[PDB]
């Protein structure tokens, strides 16, 4: 499987089975810059 | 499988089976810049 | 499979089977800039 | 499969089978700029 | 398959089989600019 | 298949089989600008 | 499986079975720069 | 399995079974720089 | 299993069974630099 | 199992069974530099 | 099992059974440099 | 199966969406 | 199965989405 | 099964999403 | 099973998400 | 099973997420 | 089982997340 | 089982996370 | 079992995390 | 069992973590 | 069993961690 | 059993950790 790439939060490469992944984010003025390629 | 690329939140490359992925985001004035290519 | 690219939220490349992906976003004045190509 | 590109929300490249993807967005004055090409 | 490109919401390139994709958007004065080409 | 391009909502390039795609939008004064070509 | 790469949060390469992964993030003005490639 | 790489938080390579991984982050003005490749 | 690499927090290579891993981080202006490759 | 590598916090290579691992970090202006490869 | 490598905190190679490992860190301006490879 | 109940006050822009799929193999 | 109840006040922009899928193998 | 109850005050932008999936093997 | 109750004050941007999955093997 | 109760004051950006999974082997 | 109660003051950005999993072997 | 109670003052960025897992062998 | 009570003052960035696991062999 | 009580003053970055595990053999 | 009480003053970066494990053989 | 009481002054970086394990053979 391919690489899992994240800045904030989680990067999950393993297979997930009956298994919950969750993330609650509360941001006051976030700024995100992505240069994907 | 291809690379999973994320700035905030989760990048999941593994196969997910009976398995919940969730993310609750509450942003006050987010700004997102993406240069996809 | 191709690369999954996201700025906020989730990038999921694995095959998902009986498995729920959800994201609740509540933004006050978001601004999104995308340059897709 | 092709690349999945998203700014906010989810980019899903894997095949999804019996599997729900959902996103609830509540925006106060969002602004979106897209330059697709 | 071709690239899935979205600013807000979801970009889904994988084949979807018995599988629901939904997005509820509630915007107060959204503004969208698209330059498609 | 061709690229799926969307600003708000979903861009779906994969073949969809027995599978529901839905989006509920409630906008107070949206403004949309499209320059398609 | 591929490498799991994260800046803040968790990088999970092992297969996860009946097992919950969660992350609660509360950011005041985060700034994220990603150069993915 | 692949290497688990994280700056803050946890890098988990072992298989996780009935086992919870969680991280609560509260950041005042975080800045993240990632050069993934 | 692959190497678990972390700067702050925990690097866990062993299989975890009925066993909880948690980390509470409270940062005032963190700065993270990652050069992943 | 692979090597567990950490700068601050814990590096755990043994299998963990019914056993809790936790770390509470409170940083005033941390700076993290990682060169992962 | 692999070597457990840590600078501050604990390096645990033995299997841990019903046994809690915890570390409370309170840093004023920590600086971490990691060259993992 | 599922019963969605939605109330909107006066002068309020609103949508209701309901999707049900029954699969019987 | 699931009953979603949503109330919106007056002059309030709102959406309700309900999805149910029943799978019987 | 699950009952989501959501109240929105007046002049408030809001969404409710409900997803249920029943699997019977 | 699970009952989510969410209140939003006036003039407040809000979302509710509910997901339930029942698996019966 | 689980009852999440969330209150948001006026003029406050907010999300509620609820996930339940029932597994019956 | 678990009851999460969360209060947010006015003008406050907030999220609630609830996850329950029931396993019955 | 577990009851998490969280209060946030006005103008305060906040998250609540609740996870419960019940295992019945 | 466990009751976590967390108070945050005004203008304060905050998280609450609750995890419970019940194992019944 | 365990009751964690945490107070944060105004303008203070804070986290609360609670973990409970019950094992019944 | 154990009651942790933690107070943080204003403008103070803080964490609370609570872990309880009950083993009943 | 054990009651940890921790006070932090203003502008002070702080952690509280509590661990309890009950073993009943």
Residue numbers in the entry:
A (entry chain K), B (entry chain I), C (entry chain G), D (entry chain E), E (entry chain C), F (entry chain A), ...: 85 to 121
L (entry chain B), M (entry chain D), N (entry chain F), O (entry chain H), P (entry chain J), Q (entry chain L), ...: 85 to 109
Paper text:
The human nucleoporin Nup98 forms fusion proteins in certain types of malignant leukaemia, is a critical component of the permeability barrier of the nuclear pore complex and is mislocalized in cytosolic deposits in Alzheimer’s disease. All four fibril types display a parallel in-register β-structure comprising short and kinked β-strands.
To gain insight into the molecular organization of cohesive FG-repeat interactions, Nup98FG85 was allowed to aggregate in pure water. Using cryo-EM, we determined the structures of four different fibril polymorphs (pm1–pm4). Polymorphs pm2 and pm3, which are almost equally populated, were solved at a resolution of 3.3 and 2.8 Å, respectively, and are formed by two protofilaments. The most common motif shared by the four polymorphs is a 13-residue β-turn/β-arch structure. A leucine-phenylalanine pair (L91-F92) is located at the tip of the β-turn, with both side chains pointing away from the turn. The other LF motifs in the four fibril structures show a very similar structure. In all four Nup98FG85 fibril structures, side chains stacked along the fibril axes build glutamine and asparagine ladders (top). Most of the stabilizing interactions arise where there are clusters of two to four phenylalanine rings and one or more leucine side chains. We obtained values of approximately −20 kcal mol–1 per chain for the four Nup98FG85 fibril structures.
